[PDB]
Design a protein around this ligand. Structure first.
Ligand SMILES: CCCCCCCCCCCCCCCCCC(=O)OC[C@H](CO[C@@H]1O[C@H](CO[C@H]2O[C@H](CO)[C@H](O)[C@H](O)[C@H]2O)[C@H](O)[C@H](O)[C@H]1O)OC(=O)CCCCCCCCCCCCCCCCC
Ligand code: CLA
Ligand code: CLA
Ligand code: CLA
Ligand SMILES: CCCCCCCCCCCCCCCCCC(=O)OC[C@H](CO[C@@H]1O[C@H](CO)[C@H](O)[C@H](O)[C@H]1O)OC(=O)CCCCCCCCCCCCCCCCC
Ligand SMILES: CCCCCCCCCCCCCCCCCC(=O)OC[C@H](CO[C@@H]1O[C@H](CO)[C@H](O)[C@H](O)[C@H]1O)OC(=O)CCCCCCCCCCCCCCCCC
Ligand SMILES: CCCCCCCCCCCCCCCC(=O)OC[C@H](CO[C@@H]1O[C@H](CS(=O)(=O)O)[C@@H](O)[C@H](O)[C@H]1O)OC(=O)CCCCCCCCCCCCCCC
Ligand SMILES: CCCCCCCCCCCCCCCC(=O)OC[C@H](COP(=O)(O)OC[C@@H](O)CO)OC(=O)CCCCCCCCCCCCCCC
Ligand SMILES: CCCCCCCCCCCCCCCC(=O)OC[C@H](COP(=O)(O)OC[C@@H](O)CO)OC(=O)CCCCCCCCCCCCCCC
Ligand SMILES: CC1=C(/C=C/C(C)=C/C=C/C(C)=C/C=C/C=C(C)/C=C/C=C(C)/C=C/C2=C(C)CCCC2(C)C)C(C)(C)CCC1
Ligand SMILES: CC1=C(/C=C/C(C)=C/C=C/C(C)=C/C=C/C=C(C)/C=C/C=C(C)/C=C/C2=C(C)CCCC2(C)C)C(C)(C)CCC1
Ligand SMILES: [Cl-]
Ligand SMILES: [Cl-]
Ligand SMILES: [Fe+2]
Lengths: 30, 253, 333, 68, 37, 32, 64, 341, 35, 30, 46, 31, 32, 37, 30
């Protein structure tokens, strides 16, 4: 029961890592 | 575009809306008070005060009502074990419901000021800007605090017109609610003497009334005025947070 | 044109987003292997005989361990320093009993991080920078290899490596204090000075630069919109910041050069970590810490007690309880 | 930081005076009685073969001189 | 003035979105084992 | 015994500040 | 030219004194005297509560 | 003009050192903490309170010298020189461990004077006061471990002594009695400290590495004008670098240095809160679930249930010589033996 | 009715006043000397 | 006098006293 | 209490430093020198 | 001219080395 | 006996579409 | 065209806000007794 | 336990009624 909560939290942290890496705002110039 | 951590800085210069959010905060605190009181009544077990006291059950806001003398509920049971006949208006559930009514009243008071914030108190009558006279406001509030402090110490503590406070056997067997004789000698500073708590507020409220009238009358110096920036408002917040956390270590100790 | 030429041009391109390079072909698949084994073994690993004394140890989430107590168990001591892959085992219900995935994950993770250091060289050379990021990254690589490779070589078993988990890390640290007395060792105090000085210097520089930002915005919006990206204007008055620091402490402990300040920031914690990286490697070969047992002696010959003679009692208390079911002969753990 | 030669009368003469004073402040054994630390045969009296144990609070000035 | 002369706008960019969500999930991952006990 | 209160506390501490940040992000990225 | 209430007419002299302050020092030295007396008062009650200052009528025995 | 004008002319006159309106606090109320620590480490024993000879005069070294805490019978008194425990007898006051209560409670105002001096120079030279709010975190740490922790826990004896080998005793004290390891507030603290130590090395090895081209020789330190309107490190290049290696990378060097400000003070405040929670003996000791499962099923044996069974071995061995005022002598059968390890 | 604790106490309120007076006199002795 | 005069002397004046004390401790013929 | 300590330090800083709340001005002078200006910015007797 | 700062620093270094060598010698077999 | 899952289902069915509607309302009233 | 020529804006007024919130709470009040059983 | 959930849902429905009555958009003219 709580193992699913643990796994959901770890997978959600990894998903936010994924979206932060790839779907960021482009750092744009002048 | 404001950051998320400074969104309450739009009411630095809008005192009616400042009063509105003061009222909303007060309503939320009173709402917590009433809801925690009702929840703690519904969980509380009055079955045996000899072996199952209040503090074994994790009861939190009821040993403050019992501390200041609320010792009876609408069920007829009391704290020490026997039953009392007349519950009166002021039982535990009555105190809780009164706080819920305060929450609703302060809610409806909070709506009105932000609906109508643009009145003529919050306006300089001399030159025509939106200011507020902080030493005189402080004199008013210190005078009010002195009045309530003196009244609480004189009447409600000592049993002149209120019912008194919990003064107990030091060995923890035969405690009850009692009117307190205020002691004025050196034993009033021993904190195991409830006469010290009684004689405290009598002097404290009187001195607060004197200082409040002093600040209503006189005006500060230009030296301290520029040295503390009394024309600003946020110096009051910086001083008040200081006073509050000085109080917090005392009430924790 | 040719297949190999087009493949080399793709793999040394700088326009694909996450750079690869030539160390990347060992950095990427090996660390993906280590991650894909670690996520499975943190969740559903059967209990492991860490001791070789027929006592399996639960480490995974499914067998009554939360996130803090969950850990990948290291290899048994009977396995020793022997290389023990999957194909030498009998079954996958026999590989996981004798400390399976630790042996795989550690040997993958080390080859991953060395090639990651090579990649940090390679992309700097491909862009045209100066190449010394990998020199600074050599310090946590040494700190990882000392606890995962050098110390189990020194102790002769892969058991005494660090368990891959939060609650296992501390059971490594406390028993390491028991057998080696890491606190009474001068390399470790240099590393403590390294990490505390690194925190001090980071907070100090981030204070003294943020305290000198040139006003370019208003006071309602963010204070971070004053820096438009890719400009040529120095957004912090380093002259005024250095004058404030010189008034604060010293004028001969100046570090007026910004480049000297950055060399000092780059060389304080890296050299701090290098000495603990040597210290673990020296304690791996049983070159112990300090020892001040029974030093303070009165004029008769009796024994007085100091703080060292209290830490001796604490380390005795740890030592007579670590590995409670194995030790029979009175020393050599 | 380099402007100093000054082989000075008040400066260079008084430093070995403080050095010899700090030497004799230990070698005469006065520091033991000044700060109360025991001497290498005085940790254990014959009536007390243990570390001392300060028991009570308000009579500590009367108790430590017993423990000496 | 009956309309408010201090109506102002909150602003929260994507970087702060990722920081806040990562903070909330890392706090959850840390404290969840101690909450469930 | 598992904290049935605790799982609700976990779910609430997930969902409430997440929604709080999503409101502000969508309000921000609406204009630009 | 805002909103006009009878309380707005009543309480207006309280919000009238917009920034009239004394030149010179004023009651600053007397303020300093009261601050020093308050500090001595807190030092008194702190040392009593710590019982670093034993009195006659103060018991500190948890028995009264 | 008057008084409080020539006294503001001076105290703000500039010289090599800078004394100020709070330097008048900082320089007198500190430097006696330093002198008292040096005096207690060099000259002053600890034979009477603890039972430990810890001075330079008694053969100890720089590692093993410590100004020691008073005995447990001095429960929470301030331990003045004069007064109800020493009566001004300076030798007895030094013997009763009054030097620790001198130095700690005297340098607690030294920290206040230093942060106010740091706050006053930032008003004199007109800069933003972000250097002041960072130093509040080691003040919170100092208060949390030396002041609030001994108050609510029956003695100044249960406080970390001012030394080097005594801080180690305090660390093993928490490790064997409190299990300070399992505190999530301590996890916050080590994350803040070690991430700040990370980001310092990152920024230092990045800025002078993506550096521009101004000089002639390879000694790039000689090519910096301190009075400069240009840059000295290519922000675009370092952004592209760390974006292609690591993924997310900064683009705003306002936010970078503010993040360097924000990490370790967040770590140290979130450690101070846990030290408060440990002072009230609300320790992060054993759970419910694995313990009630391990009492039933014998072969469970997690690293958790090994750390608990190891901390018991710490607490049953070190106590009988750590705290003699308990007056307990364990027989050897009572001690956790391990069956002849 | 003065206990020895209050006896040795009031000397401290004397002595702290002497220390602050020595600070103030050290200010006046050199400040108005220079100006 | 001078604040620089005081900061030069008043720190380093007890230093030689303590150093002579420590050297006498080290030459205690125990 | 310990958190309100930090909140008090923050508002005590931000009250006094209202004019330089969001950045230094463009014209910080040459008064950052060591010994030339014999007073830190105050103009009583230089 | 004066006695140079490098010749001062060499003698200060010898004063350091002699005191630290005596500290190790009193560290080994003295108390 | 009360449900283990019922209060979680109640709280989730409260909070999720509420936040979904609040996002859209704040995005709408931001522009006008 | 590389940027999307069909980026369009959702719109939800205060009347629909009150309708949606009232719908969700009325559904909750109705089904909550049967869920708790 | 569930009585508090019942009471919370009823009070929340009444609160949405209150805000719908008094804090509506003004129905404005041409
Ligand atoms: C910002 C940073 C500021 C920078 C540093 C500034 C330096 C200021 C130094 C202040 C020192 C305050 C501690 C006073 C010394 C003390 O310990 O004095 C001791 C007293 C309490 O005394 C103790 O009380 C206990 C119980 O006593 C009670 O029970 C006994 C018999 O039953 C007696 O009858 C006794 O009279 C009765 O009171 C025990 O008897 C102890 O032996 C006895 O020492 O504490 C007290 O004064 C403290 C309570 C009053 C002050 C409240 C604020 C200070 C503490 C805040 C946190 C409180 C703890 C929270 C949890 C941690
Ligand atoms: C008496 C309490 C009090 C009051 C009235 C204020 C008032 C203010 N603070 Mg402040 N503050 C306080 C305590 C207080 N503070 C404390 C203790 C700290 C230290 C942690 C701070 C740290 C602080 C910073 C760092 C800043 C302010 C700022 C501000 C101003 C704008 C606030 C804003 O929009 O932020 C909006 C913030 C939020 C909406 C976040 C709220 C989310 C919180 C973290 C979770 C909810 C808490 C929860 C309900 C439990 C709290 C109840 C109870 C225990 C307190 C405002 C004048 C800002 C300022 O100076 O203006 C530029 C600013 O930058 N404050
Ligand atoms: C600015 C410097 C400064 C500050 C803040 C302190 C602060 C402190 N010292 Mg300390 N000290 C100082 C300098 C300072 N010291 C110096 C220079 C020395 C060397 C001589 C010492 C030597 C020393 C010793 C030996 C001891 C202390 C101790 C203490 C602590 C308790 C003191 C106490 O109870 O008195 C309380 C004092 C007051 C409340 C002040 C009195 C003010 C009232 C209101 C009277 C009004 C003024 C009065 C009339 C005088 C004015 C004169 C008039 C003509 C104008 C306290 C933290 C004790 C300690 O460490 O505790 C363990 C202790 O035993 N101090
Ligand atoms: C770490 C400590 C610390 C620091 C750095 C500050 C810093 C600041 N405070 Mg402050 N304050 C503190 C603690 C602190 N506070 C505490 C504990 C209180 C009590 C609640 C206050 C109450 C307070 C008020 C009421 C006000 C400030 C104000 C200020 C600001 C202006 C400077 C000033 O006048 O301070 C004053 C100097 C100090 C607080 C330092 C103490 C110095 C004295 C000499 C210590 C007394 C020693 C004493 C004699 C020892 C004997 C007792 C001992 C035996 C126990 C500044 C940001 C003002 C402000 O923000 O408005 C502009 C303001 O109005 N503070
Ligand atoms: C430098 C100056 C120095 C001055 C020094 C002296 C200072 C005194 C100044 C005068 C103070 C007067 C207050 C005295 C009260 C003593 C309290 C006391 O003893 O408690 C004790 C008394 C006695 O009360 C009883 O005492 C018993 C003792 O066992 C029991 O405890 C009883 O329970 C208790 O009730 O309490 C009182 O009854 C006080 C009630 C009297 C209050 C009078 C009401 C005042 C109304 C003012 C109206 C103002 C109108 C103008 C405003 C217009 C509005 C716009
Ligand atoms: C002006 C300069 C002020 C500098 C203050 C120095 C304070 C340390 C005093 C050393 C001392 O007295 O012990 C000096 C003692 C004296 O030596 C001891 O004498 C005893 C006599 O019985 C025994 O022989 C001991 O075994 C012997 O060690 O030795 C030591 O502790 C080690 C040598 C000291 C030098 C090591 C480095 C000192 C630490 C420097 C820290 C700098 C970083 C600060 C970070 C913040
Ligand atoms: C049975 C086993 C199952 C295993 C499953 C494995 C799952 C993991 C796979 C990784 C998926 C996520 C990355 C894919 C997206 C990507 O390629 O970026 C998209 C870009 C776009 O490039 C562009 O890509 C173009 C090709 S494409 O059409 O766009 O795809 C190309 O034409 C162009 O030149 C180039 O610019 O690709 C690149 O920059 C380089 C490609 C390789 C980089 C990805 C590998 C990095 C993985 C990190 C490993 C460490 C992580 C450790 C564990 C946490
Ligand atoms: C010098 C005056 C100082 C007054 C300070 C008052 C501070 C504010 C107190 C408000 C809370 C009251 C506490 C609960 C009080 C309370 O609970 O009362 C209780 C009581 C009603 O309850 P019951 O009669 O049922 O009592 C319960 C028992 O009888 C049943 O067992 O009220 C009264 O009968 C008279 C109360 C008079 C209260 C007077 C206050 C209103 C007028 C104040 C006007 C002052 C203006 C001063 C201008 C200078
Ligand atoms: C190639 C394979 C190797 C790399 C793979 C690993 C990549 C790691 C990516 C980290 C994602 C974190 C995004 C932060 C959110 C984010 O996107 O930040 C974005 C931020 C962008 O800065 P900006 O200049 O754009 O900000 C402009 C301003 O307006 C606001 O800052 O970048 C950083 O500051 C770098 C900080 C990274 C800090 C990373 C620490 C995270 C630790 C891990 C946390 C999760 C725990 C894991 C356990 C399950
Ligand atoms: C999570 C958490 C947190 C926070 C908390 C809080 C802050 C809470 C609050 C809560 C609250 C805040 C509560 C309250 C509520 C309220 C209520 C429940 C009430 C309402 C109202 C009413 C019901 C009224 C009605 C009415 C009206 C309106 C009209 C007239 C009539 C009447 C009066 C009836 C912390 C971390 C700190 C701790 C832990 C947990
Ligand atoms: C007690 C007391 C007091 C105080 C007094 C004082 C003020 C003191 C001071 C003191 C002092 C003033 C001290 C000092 C010390 C220090 C020292 C003694 C030093 C040492 C050092 C050395 C030995 C060296 C080291 C090193 C360096 C850094 C360099 C190079 C080399 C080496 C590394 C080795 C009083 C009466 C008030 C009150 C009561 C108590
Ligand atoms: Cl063996
Ligand atoms: Cl173990
Ligand atoms: Fe830097």
């Amino acid at each position: 029961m709580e193992a699913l909560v643990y796994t959901f939290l770890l997978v959600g942290t990894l998903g936010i890592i994924f979206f932060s890496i790839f779907f960021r705002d482009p750092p744009r110039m002048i | 575009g404001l950051p998320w951590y400074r969104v309450h800085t739009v009411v630095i210069n809008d005192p009616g809306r400042l009063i509105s959010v003061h009222l909303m905060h007060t309503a939320l605190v009173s709402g917590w008070a009433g809801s925690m009181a009702l929840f703690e009544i519904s969980v509380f077990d009055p079955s045996d005060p000899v072996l199952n006291p209040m503090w074994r059950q994790g009861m939190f806001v009821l040993p403050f009502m019992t501390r200041l003398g609320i010792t009876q509920s609408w069920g007829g049971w009391t704290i020490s074990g026997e039953t009392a006949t007349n519950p009166g208006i002021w039982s535990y559930e009555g105190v809780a419901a009164a706080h819920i009514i305060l929450s609703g009243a302060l809610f409806l008071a909070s709506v009105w000021h932000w609906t109508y914030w643009d009145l003529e108190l919050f306006r300089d009558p001399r030159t025509g800007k939106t200011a507020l006279d902080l030493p005189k406001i402080f004199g008013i509030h210190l005078f009010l605090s002195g009045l309530l402090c003196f009244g609480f110490g004189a009447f409600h503590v000592t049993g002149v017109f209120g019912p008194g406070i919990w003064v107990s056997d030091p060995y923890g067997l035969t405690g009850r609610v009692q009117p307190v004789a205020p002691s004025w000698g050196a034993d009033g500073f021993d904190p195991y003497n409830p006469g010290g708590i009684a004689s405290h507020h009598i002097a404290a409220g009187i001195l607060g009334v004197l200082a409040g009238l002093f600040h209503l009358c006189v005006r500060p110096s230009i030296r301290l005025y520029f040295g503390l920036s009394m024309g600003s408002i946020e110096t009051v917040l910086s001083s008040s947070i200081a006073a509050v956390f000085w109080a917090a270590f005392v009430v924790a100790g | 044109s040719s297949l190999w030429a087009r493949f080399c041009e793709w793999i040394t391109s700088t326009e694909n987003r996450l750079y690869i390079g030539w160390f990347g072909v060992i950095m990427i698949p090996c660390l993906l292997t280590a991650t894909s084994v670690f996520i499975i073994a943190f969740i559903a690993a059967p209990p492991v005989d860490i001791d070789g004394i027929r006592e399996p140890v639960s480490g995974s989430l499914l067998y009554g361990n939360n996130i803090i107590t969950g850990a990948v168990i290291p290899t048994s001591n009977a396995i020793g320093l022997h290389f023990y892959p999957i194909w030498e085992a009998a079954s996958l219900d026999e590989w996981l009993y004798n400390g399976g995935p630790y042996q795989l994950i550690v040997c993958h993770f080390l080859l991953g991080v060395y090639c990651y250091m090579g990649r940090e060289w390679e992309l700097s050379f491909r862009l045209g920078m100066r190449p010394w990021i990998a020199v600074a990254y050599s310090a946590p690589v040494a700190a990882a290899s000392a606890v995962f490779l050098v110390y189990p070589i020194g102790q002769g078993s892969f058991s005494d490596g660090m368990p891959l988990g939060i609650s296992g890390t501390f059971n490594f640290m406390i028993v390491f204090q028991a057998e080696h007395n890491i606190l009474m060792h001068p390399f470790h105090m240099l590393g403590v000075a390294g990490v505390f000085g690194g925190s001090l210097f980071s907070a100090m520089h981030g204070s003294l630069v943020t305290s000198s930002l040139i006003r370019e915005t208003t006071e309602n919006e963010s204070a971070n919109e004053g820096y438009r990206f890719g400009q040529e204007e120095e957004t912090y008055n380093i002259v005024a910041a250095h004058g404030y620091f010189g008034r604060l402490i010293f004028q001969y402990a100046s570090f007026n050069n910004s480049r000297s300040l950055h060399f000092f920031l780059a060389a304080w914690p890296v050299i701090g970590i290098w000495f603990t990286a040597l210290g673990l490697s020296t304690m791996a070969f049983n070159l112990n810490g300090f020892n001040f047992n029974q030093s303070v002696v009165d004029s008769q010959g009796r024994v007085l007690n100091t703080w060292a003679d209290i830490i001796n009692r604490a380390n005795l208390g740890m030592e007579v309880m670590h590995e409670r079911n194995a030790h029979n002969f009175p020393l050599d753990l | 930081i380099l402007t100093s030669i000054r082989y000075w009368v008040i400066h260079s003469i008084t430093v070995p005076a403080l050095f010899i004073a700090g030497w004799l402040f230990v070698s005469t054994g006065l520091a033991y009685d000044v700060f109360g630390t025991p001497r290498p045969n005085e940790y254990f009296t014959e009536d007390r073969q243990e570390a001392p144990l300060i028991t009570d609070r308000f009579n500590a000035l009367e108790q430590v001189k017993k423990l000496s | 003035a009956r309309p408010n002369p201090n109506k102002q706008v909150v602003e929260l960019n994507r970087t702060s979105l990722y920081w806040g969500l990562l903070l909330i999930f890392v706090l959850a991952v840390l404290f969840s084992s101690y909450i469930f006990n | 015994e598992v904290n049935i209160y605790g799982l609700t506390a976990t779910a609430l501490f997930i969902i409430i500040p997440t929604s709080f940040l999503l409101i502000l992000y969508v309000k921000t990225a609406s204009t630009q | 030219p805002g909103l006009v209430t009878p309380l707005g007419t009543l309480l207006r002299p309280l919000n009238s004194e917009a920034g009239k302050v004394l030149p010179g020092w004023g009651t600053t030295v007397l303020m300093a005297v009261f601050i020093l007396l308050f500090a001595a008062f807190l030092l008194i009650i702190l040392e009593i509560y710590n019982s670093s200052l034993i009195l006659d009528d103060v018991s500190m025995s948890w028995e009264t | 003009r008057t008084w409080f004008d020539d006294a503001d002319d001076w105290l703000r006159q500039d010289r090599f050192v800078f004394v100020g309106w709070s330097g008048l606090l900082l320089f007198p109320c500190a430097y006696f903490a330093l002198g008292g620590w040096l005096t207690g480490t060099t000259f002053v024993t600890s034979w009477y309170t603890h039972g430990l000879a810890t001075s330079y005069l008694e053969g100890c070294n720089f590692l093993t010298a410590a100004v020691s805490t008073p005995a447990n019978s001095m429960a929470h008194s301030l331990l003045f020189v004069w007064g109800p425990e020493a009566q001004g007898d300076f030798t007895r006051w030094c013997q009763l461990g009054g030097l620790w209560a001198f130095v700690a409670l005297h340098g607690a105002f030294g920290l206040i004077g230093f942060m106010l001096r740091q706050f006053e120079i930032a008003r004199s030279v007109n800069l933003r006061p972000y250097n002041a709010i960072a130093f509040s975190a080691p003040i919170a740490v100092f208060v949390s471990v030396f002041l609030i922790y001994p108050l609510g826990q029956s003695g100044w004896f249960f406080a970390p002594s001012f030394g080097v080998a005594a801080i180690f005793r305090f660390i093993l004290f928490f490790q064997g009695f409190h299990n300070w390891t399992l505190n999530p507030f301590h996890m916050m603290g080590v994350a803040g400290v070690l991430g700040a130590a990370l980001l310092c090395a990152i920024h230092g090895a990045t800025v002078e590495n993506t550096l521009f081209e101004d000089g002639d020789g390879a000694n790039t330190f000689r090519a910096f004008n301190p009075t400069q309107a240009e840059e000295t490190y290519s922000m675009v290049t370092a952004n592209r670098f760390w974006s292609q290696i690591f993924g997310v990378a900064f683009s705003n060097k306002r936010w970078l240095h503010f993040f360097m400000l924000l990490v370790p003070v967040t770590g140290l405040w979130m450690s101070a809160i846990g030290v408060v929670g440990l002072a009230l003996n609300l320790r992060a000791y054993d759970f419910v679930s694995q313990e009630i499962r391990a009492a039933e099923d014998p072969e469970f044996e997690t690293f958790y249930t090994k750390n608990i069974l190891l901390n018991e071995g710490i607490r049953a061995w070190m106590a009988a010589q750590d705290q003699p005022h308990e007056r307990l002598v364990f027989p050897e059968e009572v001690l956790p033996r391990g069956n002849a390890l | 009715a003065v206990t020895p604790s209050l006896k040795n106490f009031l000397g401290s309120l004397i002595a702290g006043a002497t220390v602050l007076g020595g600070i103030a006199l050290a200010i006046t002795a050199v400040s108005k000397f220079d100006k | 006098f001078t604040v620089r005069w005081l900061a030069i002397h008043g720190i380093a004046v007890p230093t030689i006293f303590f150093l002579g004390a420590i050297t006498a401790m080290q030459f205690i013929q125990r | 209490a310990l958190l309100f300590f930090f909140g008090h330090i923050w508002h005590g800083a931000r009250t006094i430093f209202r004019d330089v709340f969001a950045g230094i001005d463009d014209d910080i002078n040459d008064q950052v020198e060591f010994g030339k200006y014999k007073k830190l910015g105050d103009t009583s007797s230089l | 001219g004066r006695i140079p700062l490098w010749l001062v620093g060499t003698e200060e270094g010898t004063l350091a080395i002699g005191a630290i060598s005596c500290f190790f010698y009193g560290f080994l077999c003295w108390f």
